[PDB]
Ligand binder design. Sequence first.
Ligand SMILES: [Cl-]
Ligand SMILES: [Cl-]
Ligand code: NA
Ligand code: NA
Ligand code: NA
Ligand code: NA
Ligand code: NA
Ligand code: NA
Ligand code: NA
Ligand code: NA
Lengths: 213, 216, 208
Amino acid sequence: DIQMTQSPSSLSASVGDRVTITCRASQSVSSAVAWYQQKPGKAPKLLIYSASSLYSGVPSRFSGSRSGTDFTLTISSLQPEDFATYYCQQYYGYYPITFGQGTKVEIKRTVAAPSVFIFPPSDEQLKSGTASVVCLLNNFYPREAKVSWYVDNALQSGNSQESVTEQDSKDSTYSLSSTLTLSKADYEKHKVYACEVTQGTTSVTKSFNRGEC
Amino acid sequence: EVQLVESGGGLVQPGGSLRLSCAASGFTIYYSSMHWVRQAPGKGLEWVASISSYYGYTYYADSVKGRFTISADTSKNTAYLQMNSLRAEDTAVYYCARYYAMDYWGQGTLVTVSSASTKGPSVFPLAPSSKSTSGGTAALGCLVKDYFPEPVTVSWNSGALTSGVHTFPAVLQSSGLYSLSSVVTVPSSSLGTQTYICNVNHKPSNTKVDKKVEPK
Amino acid sequence: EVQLVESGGGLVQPGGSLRLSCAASGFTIYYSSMHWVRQAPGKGLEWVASISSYYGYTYYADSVKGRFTISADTSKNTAYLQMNSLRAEDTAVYYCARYYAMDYWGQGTLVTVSSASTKGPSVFPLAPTAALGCLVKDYFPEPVTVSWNSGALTSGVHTFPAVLQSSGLYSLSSVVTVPSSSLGTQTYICNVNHKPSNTKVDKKVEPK
Ligand SMILES: [Cl-]
Ligand SMILES: [Cl-]
Ligand code: NA
Ligand code: NA
Ligand code: NA
Ligand code: NA
Ligand code: NA
Ligand code: NA
Ligand code: NA
Ligand code: NA
């Protein structure tokens, strides 16, 4: 079975940089390899076919090459419209088609600490017996961060979910939300609600006390 | 002039059936291999099925073998994906594409497979505090809760507020219902004079919810 | 619009070589099989050579194998037909086309394998509803093309198939019928192009 192993999973680059993305086939696929660009919410766009052929319309800054089972996509000088996800694909034939897992090309910027807010459940929601506590991490970099919920200083396990925005096109930051779900009864029996954000050697905890405004 | 227009997506119970159509224009499908490729949310492209030009031999990924059927009606210049015995993991945007090196793609259609019932969102306020503890900044938002299926769109002030808005990808709750939040940050001083309303459109249930979010 | 434009025909000595090209626009040739098909004058269509999509495996009629070579250049979006050791039997209009049920064709280019030399036409007026024309005499090889008034006169033109004369040189007439009321006011000019000898002849045809 043919696997297209893509390196790296993501990279940070700046406009003007030279970006190399490697894809390695688990065995020979001749030159039957294609490269695609995809942006969030849109269908993928073909850039290279037969591993080195620039598809019609594609700016010449994209180039594909092959050395045996190694396939590399090169962008000689990254443009602002080039920040996207790229996928290698083999179409050689016995699966006749196998996509790489993808490489996301993210904008590089300086580290930025999030603004952290914690939202108690609305009284409107509590009436129906469920309590959603929301934690917001606003405009930070880099993307990686660990969010932990504490209820009266006890770590919460298995009752929260997170979601992350795409990189902002203006300041290149990320944002993240975590929601902690409790029954209304469990919510009322505790006082301190805290969201803990860790990045590197810093932890920042935002909290509220149920009842105090 | 070459265009691929998909239709037929939607919601179906586990084990149920859907037929996706890929209507081709600008070119005769008989001469062209046709392919279905899907993208579950947050994940990569996965090839589903292929049909060859001329004869139309068919090929399927192991994950869909024995369950999906790719076909083409030349007289309608249209290719199909018949999806039987559907499964919750089939939930994905499905794309149709032309040629083995896929130069033209359909626009993608959402397929949701779940036993949950269609219902519109409850929208709860994420009220800003009136005294800020964040410098002079206030975060406010709407918690868009327990809707099904995807998608919803969110705007603030009917499109008048876009600076600083973050509308997060939805999460699938263990109830089988989706939830998302949409937040904006604003100056704290504007809390007493500017109104903030989130607008939540949920086409699959024909429901829109507007929620005015007032300070705590 | 999908288009195939062929080039590279013309007169070749027996034993010589010619390279046909088929320049494709409006599609990416990589995705399409290309085929060469020839037509001997007044005869049927005969398949010569095929080149497959993607891989580019080649197939040939038995009567050209080891002598012709079909190929494709993706960075030029052109297919070719290298023809070596041409013989008189290879004389034909050669077409390039895409797909096995060939939906688009080149305009066709005539390959003439002969040891007679090239010779441009002599054009004579056929002077005057009124009929008038141009006698296009003593040329080799084919083809010639005739227009009238630079193509502004098309209604009622009859350009006749060439006849091979006993000299081995072709001759033809192209005639047009016009209102006799225009014989004094409108001028009539035949435009005769013989690309094999790089020669165009323009002849004003006047009433006598
Ligand atoms: Cl509730
Ligand atoms: Cl708050
Ligand atoms: Na810093
Ligand atoms: Na990191
Ligand atoms: Na799965
Ligand atoms: Na909206
Ligand atoms: Na969300
Ligand atoms: Na959520
Ligand atoms: Na070819
Ligand atoms: Na002629």
